[PDB]
């Protein structure tokens, strides 16, 4: 052991359903049982820092086989911002639903957003299960969620539901603390280990570009993921028609290498490629692992006024820049049926059409800007073409 699989989880669900009570109950019960830093309600409900303004907390807990980074946010606003910008990373999500109230609005909203941003797996923890002494009832509160998760394409019929109480356990009533651990079992069993950047296909966002008389053209940048080995084929995707080409060499700090790997800045030499055949906004990629698209469906968050966002709303015919990886491309937006204006601070489904194509796939994040001044954030929820 020492440093084992790192998994990013989080808590979601309608307000005061017990998300922050569960987080605490987890650090604690887990800290006891397996050993680690424990934390309680009162100081986990605090909504500090930010970066990518979000009110969030962070906690780390361990299981005999995994290390978990858990995220919990005070209110719905913080979750939307986090899931859309991608600041709050989740390989899996713990949907905390009070058996008392049952599936509420924000609960559906989180399952929805969750699907729009890429949350790959959702585990359910039916909380406040101590306030209910019924048996046939919590049988529904569960069939509600099953059906619901299914509404948005989550295997509701297979989603693990855990009846518990982030309170009874949290305090010490081991009888329920056993649920905190069973939940922890599903984290380990139902949440698959995240694939590490190098394991994914090769993607290199082009930064600088210059030609080499006899051989062709070299492009530079950081490997976002994958590995580019000298001699393999690669594609130039974006803006113009995709092109093929062999990598005849890699260099870094003037030293030629046999390969370039994720997390590194390198130079790749494209055999037969002319410098004018390269545009900024293009990427290098394992042949056929990503394609150029010009239209997509996205979920965007418009920065609020107090986050430095625009002081005024925008209307149809609004045409800003969508910043992708390296460059911001121009696009037109189509708003939801009967949506006139989008107010600062709002989040909405948006169909965007770019004037130039960009390499992309569901899950790609991007910034919405005006004059190089970022006013919004989004994630591609569905490439339409």
């Amino acid at each position: 052991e020492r440093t084992k699989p790192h998994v990013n989880v989080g808590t979601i669900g309608h307000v005061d359903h017990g998300k922050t009570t569960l987080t605490a109950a987890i650090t604690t019960v887990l800290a006891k049982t397996y050993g680690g830093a424990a934390r309680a309600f009162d100081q986990i409900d605090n909504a500090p820092e930010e970066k990518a303004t979000i009110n969030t907390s962070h906690v780390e807990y361990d299981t005999p086989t995994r290390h978990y980074a858990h995220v919990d946010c005070p209110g719905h606003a913080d979750y939307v911002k986090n899931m859309i910008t991608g600041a709050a990373q989740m390989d899996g999500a713990i949907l905390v639903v009070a058996a008392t109230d049952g599936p509420m609005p924000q609960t559906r909203e989180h399952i929805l957003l969750g699907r729009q941003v890429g949350v790959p797996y959702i585990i359910v923890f039916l909380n406040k299960c101590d306030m209910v002494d019924d048996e046939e009832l919590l049988e529904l509160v569960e069939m509600e969620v099953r059906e619901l998760l299914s509404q948005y394409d989550f295997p509701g019929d297979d989603t693990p539901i855990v009846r518990g109480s982030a309170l009874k356990a949290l305090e010490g009533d081991a009888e329920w603390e056993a649920k905190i651990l069973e939940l922890a079992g599903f984290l380990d069993s139902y949440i698959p280990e995240p694939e590490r950047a190098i394991d994914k296909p090769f993607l290199l966002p082009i930064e600088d570009v210059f030609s080499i008389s006899g051989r062709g053209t070299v492009v530079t940048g950081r490997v976002e993921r994958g590995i580019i080995k000298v001699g393999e084929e690669v594609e130039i995707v974006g803006i113009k028609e995709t092109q093929k080409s062999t990598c005849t060499g890699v260099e870094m700090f003037r030293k030629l290498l046999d390969e370039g790997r994720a997390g590194e800045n390198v130079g790749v030499l494209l055999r037969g490629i002319k410098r004018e055949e390269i545009e900024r906004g293009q990427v290098l990629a394992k042949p056929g692992t990503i394609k150029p698209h010009t239209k997509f469906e996205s979920e965007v968050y418009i920065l609020s006024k107090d986050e430095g966002g625009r002081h005024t709303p925008f209307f149809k015919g609004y045409r800003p820049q969508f910043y992708f990886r390296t460059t911001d491309v121009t696009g037109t937006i189509e708003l939801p049926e009967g949506v006139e204006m989008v107010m600062p601070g709002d989040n909405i489904k948006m169909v965007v059409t770019l004037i130039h194509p960009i390499a992309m796939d569901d899950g790609l994040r991007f910034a919405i800007r005006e004059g190089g001044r970022t006013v919004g954030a989004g994630v591609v929820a569905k490439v339409l073409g």
Binding site: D208, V218, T220, G249, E251, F253, R254, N265, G267
Partner: peptide
Amino acid sequence: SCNCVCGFCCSX
């Protein structure tokens, strides 16, 4: 290429 500590750059 064209870098040497940590800029964007290269060679080939």
